[model samples]
Every structure is written in C-alpha cells, then in structure tokens.
Target: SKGEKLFTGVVPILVELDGDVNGHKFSVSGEGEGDATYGKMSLKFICTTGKLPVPWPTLKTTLMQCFARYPDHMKQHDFFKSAMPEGYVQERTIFFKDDGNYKTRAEVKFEGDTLVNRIELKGVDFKEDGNILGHKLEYNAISGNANITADKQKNGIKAYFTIRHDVEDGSVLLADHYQQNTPIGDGPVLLPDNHYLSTQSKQSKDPNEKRDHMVLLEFVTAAGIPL
Candidate 1:
C-alpha cells in the first residue's frame, strides 16, 4: 500500500557515515517487524575510532535527519496510493537536541491519530566486533505505547522499523546503496482502514498467535543521493 511504501521510504534512512576521524569510521542500520497487537522496529549507529569507542552523544543530529525525511516520502505514498496509511505523522512529534558535548541523543515518538497506542523506546549501546565498531538504538522500550490492533477477528497489521549500524575502520560512504528487494511479505489481512486499531481502546491487543511476515528487502544502493 502507498502508506506502507511512504512509511518505508522516509524512515531509518542512512545519514552521514562518510569521512574519518583518524582511523575512525561510521555507519547506520534500520529494521522492523509486526504482529497481531503491536509492531516494533529499531535503528542503530556504529563508529570505529581506530583506537577508541564512539560516544553515544555524537549521534543526535544524524537521527534528526532520518526523521525529517520520512513524512514527505510518506505523503508521496498517500498521493499516489490515494489512501492514508494510518501513521502518526500529522499528530505525533519528532524530537532531538544537541548536547554541549560532541555526542547526540535522539528519538521518534508516535501519538495515535487513528488508534490508542503507547510510546516506546528500544535498545541502545556502543560495542566493537573484531575490526568493526558499532552502536544500536531501538524503540521497543515503550512496548505498551507502541501497541496497536485492528480487526474483528482481531488479526493485526503493522511494521517494525529498525536500523543496523557498522563501520569498517575507514570506508567512504556509498551513495545509492539504499535499495530493498521487491514483494515484501505483509502480515494479517485486515480491511483497509481496519488493519490498524482504534485510538479509543485501552484494552491490550497482543497477538492471539504468532505468524511470520516475510518481505523481499533489497538495499542495492543509495550512494548517488546528495547527503
């Protein structure tokens, strides 16, 4: 659907991962998954400082850029698809700020415009694997706030947003590296507007059962777009 297409395009976009601070390098990743009652996704950053670990604070502004680009893409989907995707865009807010230090912290929250869902924050950290350096920021912390359920049979439809981060010590940013494979798997089959839950319900909407939502994702390239 256009809403999903729009939602997918703008989100979890890779920000600046170019240049090098000494032997240091940077990279970012995003991923998602959805079930009956709720859906979840996360984005993370990775930096290899040649000989040091990357600071969490430095990633603040990079996150803002990712959120800022989502709405317009989503809107494009709405225009072409001719139907809203039941997102939190028009009603929700995107927040970020730069600390006095070199590091940054950022988050994206969803305020239910069509359904009553909770706000969520997921994983966060900085780590290194062999020659690789990386970090992860997730939105699963607010599990309750991220809840949503839509359907008479109660079958739900949603998407999880995630980012996978990595840095190869020193690698130039690759433009046009952003591409996803086709025919992504969708979850339960609910009515167009009924796929998502309502904002009026306080009752929890956990999945009655679990099912795989397979999607053909391709990140062939996005290196040409001006950063």
Candidate 2:
C-alpha cells in the first residue's frame, strides 16, 4: 500500500480507444477503475459525468505524441501484441496474421506502477437479411469469466472477461448494428501504457460514409492529466 506506484499516491490510470464503423462514430476514454483488486484493474470513465472530454481518437493520438515527449510507448512484445487468438485485438486488420503460429496468452499483473488492462471492444457489424446473417467484423476481448474475475493469481495474469456492452453510449450512438461477441486474439498479449491500440468493425456496407467509434483506457491524475 505504500510501495507500488500503482496502488499508492495518485490512482486512476488512463486508457483510450478509437475506430470507425457503419457511418456512425464513437470516441471513448477512461481512467482506471478502483485498484488492482485481486490482480485486476479496470477502466472507469466517470470523468465529466459520462460526457467525458475530448474524443479519445484524437486524444489517443495526442497521448502518443505526448508519450513521445516522455518516451514510454512500449515495444510490441512488452504490450499490445498481434500474437493471440482471443484479444484486445491489435489495430491492424487481423484475420490475416500467420500461415500458422505458436501458442500464447490481460487485468494485467503489475509489480510496480504499470500494466494496462485487457479491456477490448467486443461487438461488430453484420448483415441481417431475413433468415440470413453475415459477419463483417467481430472482436472478442477475452473468454471464461473465470479468466477475469479471480481473486489471486500470478503477476499480470488475469484470465479473461466479456466486456460489458455498456463501455459507453449503450444509449446514444446507434446500436442497430451491434452484433454479438466473437473473441479477437488468441495467444498471449498485453496492452502497454502510453500506447494506442484499437479496433474498428463495420456492421453495414457504408464505405466512406462510415461512423467513428472510440475506446480508451488511461491512468491519470485527479485533474485528468495522463500519468
């Protein structure tokens, strides 16, 4: 309680996400939720009374530049990797990874003042043409509730969790395209601090007329400055 920077002094870390979809848009952000209780740290966007502040897409980019000022964007293997099956999927259009690869592995375990959440976008856009269903994009952050809801485990090894569809505007935006859950990455991966990793799925065939959505997780000061 007095050592690990993650649990001491200023809490509430930062996280964020951004992407496009079906002509609708969403830009999201969040500060860390509670502590690393039972080895899990979540994001809570209670800032600005749910209206939040800037759209996280820009913020994500901004923080990346800001992070450049400080030098903390982690290397691929350290955080944010394309080496998994059920993910917090990497931002790249991935069903195109590997002819076939090795096995792998997020409420990340931390020894000091680090570790990003395994949070992810778990929905998509698809076609619903009477008795026919087609998938355009799908993302599954994690599986097995036991994966994410444990009380104790190794450092940085929370199993997995199905992201609640309520990360943001389950009210506004447009859920008309919301497809069910389909896991993204499969192996082992970790999203690093000061890094921007995102997902974008299309539910409709609306080309340049696409909508934008955001996803973010950050740890910041009480005043909302990224730490």
Candidate 3:
C-alpha cells in the first residue's frame, strides 16, 4: 500500500527556464532556494555565435586581460587602450541577499587611448519600498579606481552610498551617507562605517568568512584569458 499527502501554503516553484537561442534567439530562466533566493538563481546570459549562455566570469576575464598589458596607459588615459571597439555593452544581473536584486549594464566607450566604462543599474526587487534613482558607476582603468554612487530613498530617509578610491596604491574609502528633509529637519549626514584590508586565514573559526576570502582567489585565477 502507498499513501501521499499534499500541503497548501506558499509552496515555492523551485526552478524555471524558457526561450530559444539556437539560430539567433535569447532565453531566460530562474531558480529558487528553499523559501529564499539569490539573483544568481536567475538565468541571464546570452551569446549566439560562441556559446549558448556565456558566463559572467568569461566577460570579466576578457576585459581584465585586455587591460593588464597597459597599466601605465590605464592611469594616464583614465581608461584601457585596447583593440576592442567602443559602443560595446555587457549586461548582467547582480544579487545580494540583504539589498535585493539589481541589473547591471556596462557600456564601453573610448576617446583616443582612454577607455571609459559606464555602468548603469536597475533594481528588480526593492521590497523595502525603496527607490533607486540615478545609480551608476564610472570605472577608470589607468588608476584602477571605480566611482560608485546612487540616489536612493529608503527606510524613511533619503540617502546614498558612495565610494572613493585612491588609485595610486589601490586604497578605497566608502561613505554610506544619507539625509532627511521633512517637518522635523533638513540634514545630510555620514553614517558610521568601517574600512580595512586584511589577509585571510584558513584556520578562521567562521566558515563563511573563510569562504568569502576564497572569492578573491577565484577571481584572480579566473582573470587570465588567451591572448
């Protein structure tokens, strides 16, 4: 004898995919984790000639390899000097557990030897009733400096997160600042924050922390590309 039982209540639809890519087409898919999800759960890469679904690491590695040969040119031109033509764009989705889902679009442009990458952001999941208006990034290859800023109103305050990088030696400073304008007061203030650089240890007690450290190692290994 056999038996079966069905329960009703917010059952997760685990995974889904759709679309066509062979012979020139695009597709999308998504997955769910238990009762939660990551932007990574979503399928969002497309390539026609080379591969069915090009990976994000592939994109990152290609750009870095082109930029590696001209570090001095990078700082002086404030961009990379490469055979790659301007007007190229790479779009991807980024997922964060706490901040929500965001779409990242990078546009490559050039002026002489200077190569500028402009990154635009669009939010997919803003469950906090937050508004992200005017979010973008300007990355300068020569200096290895990436400037990030966004106009956002969230959690009863109008605020923004900004970062400043000193490209000479690769030091970065972040400002998670914000403001308030209402019947109470009009103000802009910087929140308390911490910034540091440290070496990771495999002996660390926290497994998550150790795993986080490996992310950088993986990226370094992944950055190489065939010339």
Candidate 4:
C-alpha cells in the first residue's frame, strides 16, 4: 500500500492489564516502530505495578513515548480519502515524551471533511515558554459530532474541559447518585460509600475464553455538570 511500511521494527504491539483493584496489579507494555517513504515513527508505552502482600506504595513510574512523521503525500490526503468518498487533505506530527520528563506536541490536520486535533505543552506556567494553547479538537465524520477541549492546572485552579452527551435526567441522576437512606438489598452491592470508584470489563468473543482484567483501587468523585 503506497510503497508499504506502515509500521516497522520491534512490533510486539501490546499486552494489557489495567485492572485488579483489590490487590494492585496494573500493567501495560507496548512497542511499534516506523517507516515508509518519508515520515519516521514510534510508539511505546511502559507502565508497571504489582502488589498483593502489600508493601510497595511509591507508585508513578511512567514511560509513554510517541513519535511520528508522515508526509509522502500521506496517501494523498483528503483525510486520507475521508476514511472513502474523496475530497481530502491530511497532515501529521506527534511527539510526546513522558516519565515525568514532560513534553508534548500533537498537531494533526485532516482537511476537507475536517479533523484538527491540537496539543502542545511544556512548562505548566500556562503558556509562554513556547505558547502551548488549547481548545481545538474537531471531528466530524459526516456530523457524528465531536468538539473537545480539556486543560488542567491544579493547586492554582485552572480547569477547562468540554465534551458531553445524553442523560438529561437519567432517572434523576441515578436518584441523586444512589442515596435514599442507602440500603439496596442483595448481599454484596457495596461501592457508593464515598470518594468514588468502579470499572469492570471482561470481554470474550470466545478465543477459548480466558479473561483477566481488574485494577482501579480508588478514584471516586462524581456529581453533576449541566449546560
């Protein structure tokens, strides 16, 4: 496909496990390098953890790297043919280095049918050390709708994020987030006491069925946001 080389070198692609909650066990290992006519490439994410007999609690070992460059006409753009019906345009640039050694830059543009996701960040002094602004993420696969934005700067409070859907009432917000003298029968239903957290997904289309996924010990906080 256009001189081949969509991805090159060490491609062990993925290995997951961001679930375990009860006794800690979060893992992720991925790799993929690039090539093809002009723009080079890279993708790697390494995050590890383990704990059952407790003891280890100095978490925060991160390594997320992504580097990409592509412009051998980029398959002749139009958002690469609108994914199909012609009239296209396309551009790309991605560079995000992490492990606390923070650095970011993402500028992607797919013309004609529109697609512009932008990101650039350096020191969080809120833009100037190279001007890393926000608010420009547009997507429209023929009006499926998507315009997002999110920016955060804790302690000094600076939060600006957007993108929402449905649920005008949703059973009055799940009955004000489950609390009407609290007491929903059935042996083990717990998980609404406070601080907020819960997520589980075990997929199976039958590959001999053997699933493993669970990890998210804590992070619970939800109320409302209306506009």
Candidate 5:
C-alpha cells in the first residue's frame, strides 16, 4: 500500500502565471485543493516557457532555478522543461518517460525530503547530473495523485495533488498551501488557508524571497476550471 492515503477536493485552488524569457512567452497553469479542517494543501504548475522560481536559498543564493539544472538533452527538448516540478507534495513521483511514449512512463514514488527522493527527481532517474537544490520540503504529504505532463516536443510536468498545513499539523515546516488571506472587500476570498500559497513557510528563511519567487492562487471548478 502507499505510505499515506491520498485525497483531494476539500477546498479547490487554481493558479496561472505568465511571463517572458528573452522574448519567448510562457504560461504556467495549475489546479489543486486541500482539506480545510486539516490544513493540508496541494497544487502544481506546467509552463510552456520560462521556469518556476527555485525555492528557498537556491533561487536566493544562486539566482538560478530548476530548469537550469535539467539534463542537457531534456533541456534542449520541450518535454523535459516541465519534468522538473515545484510546489507542495507529500509523496513524489518521477515520471521517467525514456522513449517519449506511454510505454516508457516509468514512475518512481517516495516520501518527501529524503536525499534519495531529491536525487531521483533532479538527477539519476532523469539521466542528469545529481545536482539538487538541497533545501528540505517544508511539508510532507499524506499521499499523492498523478503528475502533469506534456509532449515530447515542448511543455513540462503539469500538476499533482496532496495536502499540507501549519495550524492543524503543527507544521514542523509548512508547505505552499498555508497562504496569506485577507477576508474583506477588495481583497482575498473566504476560501480555506490550505487552498492558498503559504507565506509563512515560504518566508521563514529569506524575508525578501517573495518579490521574484512567486506562486499565485485562486478558486476553480472540480474539473479544473478557473472561477
């Protein structure tokens, strides 16, 4: 059996980010949700161009992100662009599609924060050098669903599901779901905290990280439509 029982649908969240890299455009779309009472949260992004901000000291100290760390061949091909993912997930899956087909969809799953877990996703399993961001995953998930994917030509890993929270779990460290909310007119909505990006866990080490490193959140239909 999987280490934890995976579940989604308590509170829904959606995020879309757009930007340009040297005149090339990119769209990062995502869908996920978490339990309100439990404070668990989950979400993911799939981008056509640009890259997800590297978390913690990686983006801060290095001025680089996951895309720069991808294998050379994966980097040249669009499929590997999203192969590297970012966000809160308790369980992890490395979709090593070797021949660029369904028959090659070899996936490996493991708990978050272990060197083996990090190594597989960022390195060996993907046929790249074993370079890692080295920071720990703030929140560990209960279980997880599928990871997003694109074609052999372009795009990258899209999304996934799970949960994380600071209030309910005492969050040894928090995950992306523990968001900052403003419940008044001209502000954030009444959604549970798990459906939003957590500013606490994100801002703990480096106070100024949020300026460029970002993840935007919103509500969505169960089938994954923005509302």
Candidate 6:
C-alpha cells in the first residue's frame, strides 16, 4: 500500500511540441510534484530540417528552471566580452549551445557608481515526463551583466550554456550559442519587473554594503528579448 501511495502521488499530463527558432523544436510539458499539486516541467529537443523562425520574440524562460542558487562555473562562458563604457563596463547577453552535447555557463563583473555583484543561471534540473516529452533538464547557464556609463548609456552583460540530451546520441553541444546579435528583439517593453538572473523572495538590503538599494531596470524588452 505504501508503494501504491507513492506511485499514485506522482502524476503526469499531456505534452505538446513547442515551436522552435533556428533548427530545434522543443517538446514542452508539465508534471505534478506531490499530490497532483505543482510538480515541475520538462522540455525535449529534436533537430529538424527547416529554418527556425528568425527574429524570435523575446521569451524569458529560466535556463535552470530549478530551486537553487547560482552556480560557480558560469564565470567562464564566452558571453563576457571586454567592452569599455567610457570608463565603465557593461553588456547584455544570453548563452546556450550549438548542439545538445554538454552543459555551458557564464558570469561577469563591473565597477561603476557602485560595485554591482550579480549572478545568474545557477541551479537546474530536467527529466523525461512521459512519451511526448522525452527529456528532462535542470540547468542555469545564462547570466546577465549591465553597467551605466558616465554618458548614461546602459551597457549589459550575459552568460549562457546548455545541457545536452543527445550526448549519448553523438550530437555535440558546442559553446557557440553566445549571441552579440539579437537572440530576441530589442523592441517592446512588456514585463515591468522580472529577473531570470536572480530573484529576491523577501524584502532585503545589502546593509551598509551600499549596493543594496539598486533599482532594477528592464533588461529584456517587452517582447521578451534582451537588448
């Protein structure tokens, strides 16, 4: 009976094919964690023979999609370029992979009006929910960095990586998904307050650190694209 209870506690649901951009189609589905309540999510990747719809609208999904703090390996992804903002430094970026082969990650640092210590894309988990979604993933490989220049230009930073499902299938996930170009557009302003980098659940302060009162800015545009 205990085994039956455990088995019944886990429930799965319908799955669907999420549209793709570039040459990958994602399999999307959700699951119940306990008692059919909120469980988790799963996404699968399948390489196709057509072009992924280019100019993809900005879609900010958690690269890690798990409940964990930022990881340490992200400080090495290629997204962190050395750019000068007239005595300041800043960049906006997201990282992924050329193929589904290995996991990638990144991070950045900046010295401006105040010392901005930030991190992103930390903890991750993925799984095969059912027949429709054949893969599960939990990873946080993308990080964002931004700086306000002396001239008032907002520079950004981002780090990215990917977890490969086809590593067993001979597919190579390359560290070339870093985009200086627009992965998502830089047009509209949608979400007023959102952070895929790191989120604060409770009221907090740096406390005598002087970097605590920083007002958040819009990194991703309205359409979900990061500039």
Q: Which candidate should be chosen as best, given TM-score against the real structure?
A: 2
Error of 3 at 41 (Å): 31
Q: Score every model by TM-score.
A: 0.22, 0.27, 0.25, 0.19, 0.24, 0.21
Better of 2 and 6 by TM-score: 2
Position 206, candidate 1: lDDT: 28
Residue-level lDDT of model 5, residues 69-160, one tens digit each, is 21222322222112222212122232212300001011212124211111111212221221112223332212222122321232122333
Task: Kindly give the stretch of ten consecutive residues in candidate 4 with the minimal lDDT sum.
Answer: 172-181
Q: In what order do the candidates fall by TM-score, top score first?
A: 2, 3, 5, 1, 6, 4
Q: Positional deviation of 202 in candidate 3, in angstroms? A: 20
After superposition, which runs of candidate 4 have C-alpha atoms over 4 Å from their true positions? 1-6, 16-71, 74-204, 212-227
What's model 6's overall lDDT?
Answer: 0.23
Model 4 residue 62 CA deviation (Å) reads 13
Q: For model 2, what is the C-alpha lDDT against the true structure? A: 0.25
lDDT accuracy of residue 130 in candidate 6: 20
TM-score of 2: 0.27
lDDT of each: 0.24, 0.25, 0.24, 0.21, 0.24, 0.23
Candidate 3 collision pairs: 74-142, 75-142, 79-115
lDDT of 1 at 65: 14
Error of 4 at 95 (Å): 23
Per-residue lDDT tens digits of candidate 3, residues 1-227? 00000101111221112222112222222211111011011111222223323222212211211122212212221111122333234344434333344444445433343333444334444333221111121223111122212213421112122323222235432322222211111222221112111111111112443111101111111111122
- What is candidate 3's TM-score against the reference? 0.25
* TM-score: model 4 vs. ground truth: 0.19
Model 1 agreement with the true structure over 37-150: per-residue lDDT tens digits = 122223333332232233332232222111212133122211111222332211112121111112222222222322112112122222333221343322111111121222
> Considering TM-score, which of the candidate structures 1 and 5 is the better prediction for this target?
5
Total clashing residue pairs per candidate? 53, 42, 3, 11, 9, 30
